[PDB]
Amino acid sequence: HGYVQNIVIDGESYSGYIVTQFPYESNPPAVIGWATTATDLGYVDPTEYTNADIICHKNATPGALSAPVAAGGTVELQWTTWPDSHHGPVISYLANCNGNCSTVDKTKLDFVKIDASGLIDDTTVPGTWASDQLIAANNSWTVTIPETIAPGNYVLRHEIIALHSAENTDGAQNYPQCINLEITGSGTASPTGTPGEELYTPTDPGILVNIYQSLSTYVIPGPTLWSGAA
Ligand SMILES: *[C@@H]1O[C@H](CO)[C@@H](O)[C@H](O)[C@H]1NC(C)=O
Ligand SMILES: *[C@@H]1O[C@H](CO)[C@@H](O)[C@H](O)[C@H]1NC(C)=O
Ligand SMILES: *[C@@H]1O[C@H](CO)[C@@H](O)[C@H](O)[C@H]1NC(C)=O
Ligand SMILES: OC[C@H]1O[C@H](O)[C@@H](O)[C@@H](O)[C@@H]1O
Ligand SMILES: *[C@H]1O[C@H](CO)[C@@H](O)[C@H](O)[C@@H]1O
Ligand SMILES: *[C@H]1O[C@H](CO)[C@@H](O)[C@H](O)[C@@H]1O
Ligand SMILES: *[C@H]1O[C@H](CO)[C@@H](O)[C@H](O)[C@@H]1O
Ligand SMILES: *[C@H]1O[C@H](CO)[C@@H](O)[C@H](O)[C@@H]1O
Ligand SMILES: [Cu+2]
Known part of the structure; x- marks a missing residue:
């Protein structure tokens, strides 16, 4: 359980959607983070992989603000304290709002995978994962905006999938978080994206998976990493 509470881009800071506070305010501030009704700080499960909740989390609505970022620049997402038990991949997508x-x-967003990390090392079961790297780096993840992606208004969909109960059908726990970006630069690529409701299935090898054994490989779920990615 957790959420993205702060975003840093080239020395400027942007509050996330503070789901522990804003839902209970009459006049919450405008932020670049999408509002959601995931007030318990929980997850989307595989029974919702074809439903709108998987796109930007439960009942999500766009943030009223966008953050500028140069193509080729970095975006740092700062999570609340992530529990070590929630081992799994960290996956980030861009989708043009046009x-x-x-x-x-949000059902028209076609997500392009631009950053993905999975199982890092499995010498001691259940292994060291991207989520563990995230914990070690001050509970944060930094992605690079591909330098060739065309300028415009995009959603960054940034997600941890916790696999600690994924050995069972519908056991995986997806924690997606969306923010609005205004990408600048001289890029010209418009890669093909995947609709949010088509990213994952409940039986994917990275979704229905028993991490409590030595794995020789972990297939990070979702579409292929775009060749333009960092
Ligand atoms: C989420 O959206 C559904 C569909 O419109 C609605 O029925 C439900 O009440 C919403 N849940 C909230 C606002 O907590
Ligand atoms: C984008 O839409 C939001 C919500 O209506 C609005 O507040 C904002 O001013 C718009 N941005 C621009 C650049 O027009
Ligand atoms: C570490 O994260 C906290 C909150 O998550 C943030 O306020 C702080 O600036 C971060 N430190 C660095 C060096 O990024
Ligand atoms: O449009 C998708 C296409 O965009 C990139 O710029 C190319 O390098 C290809 O490798 C990729 O498949
Ligand atoms: C590691 O070993 C597994 C079998 O458990 C294979 O499925 C995988 O391709 C890799 O060789
Ligand atoms: C667990 O054992 C597997 C082989 O099945 C290795 O691939 C892995 O690195 C770990 O030692
Ligand atoms: C082991 O093999 C899988 C493909 O079966 C990869 O997706 C993984 O990254 C690792 O190379
Ligand atoms: C990942 O890469 C494949 C080809 O390697 C593409 O077909 C796909 O659209 C995605 O960009
Ligand atoms: Cu949890």
């Missing part, structure tokens, strides 16, 4: 992201129809 318009103002704050009024986008």
Whole structure:
């Protein structure tokens, strides 16, 4: 359980959607993070992989703000304290809004995988994962905006999938978090994305998986990493 509470881009800081506070305010601030009803700080499970909740988490609505970032620059996402038990991959996607992201129809976002890390080392079961690297780096993850991606208004969908109960059908726990970015630069690529409701299935090898054994490989779920990615 947890959420993205802060975002840093080239020395400027942007509050996340503080789901522990904003849902209970009459006038919460405008932020680049999407609002969600995931008030218990929980997850989306595989029974919702074809439903709108998997896109940007439960009942999510776009943030009213966007953060500028140069193509080729970095975006740092700062999570709340992530529990070590929640081992799994850390996956990040960009989707062009082709318009103002704050009024986008989230079912029309086609997500391009631009960053993904999975099982790092399994010499001691259940292994060291991207989520453990995230914990060690001050509970944060940094992604690079591909330098060739065309400028525009994009959603960054940043996600931890916790696998500690994924040995059972519908056991995986997806924690997606969306923020709005205004990407600048001289990129010209418009890679093909995947609709959020088509990213994952409940039987994917990285989704239905028993991490309490030595794994020789872990297939990170979702579409292929885009060749333009860092
Ligand atoms: C989430 O959206 C559904 C579908 O419109 C709605 O029925 C439900 O009440 C919402 N849940 C909230 C706002 O907590
Ligand atoms: C994008 O839409 C939001 C929500 O209506 C609005 O507040 C904001 O001003 C818009 N951004 C621009 C650059 O027009
Ligand atoms: C570590 O994370 C906290 C909150 O998650 C943040 O306030 C702090 O600036 C971060 N430190 C660095 C060096 O990024
Ligand atoms: O449009 C998708 C396409 O965009 C990139 O710029 C190319 O390098 C290809 O490797 C990739 O498949
Ligand atoms: C490691 O070993 C497993 C069998 O457990 C294979 O499925 C995998 O391809 C790799 O060789
Ligand atoms: C667990 O054992 C497997 C072989 O099945 C190795 O691939 C892995 O590195 C770990 O030693
Ligand atoms: C082991 O093999 C799988 C493919 O079966 C890869 O996806 C993984 O990254 C590792 O190389
Ligand atoms: C990942 O890579 C494959 C080809 O390697 C593409 O077909 C796909 O669209 C994604 O960019
Ligand atoms: Cu949890």
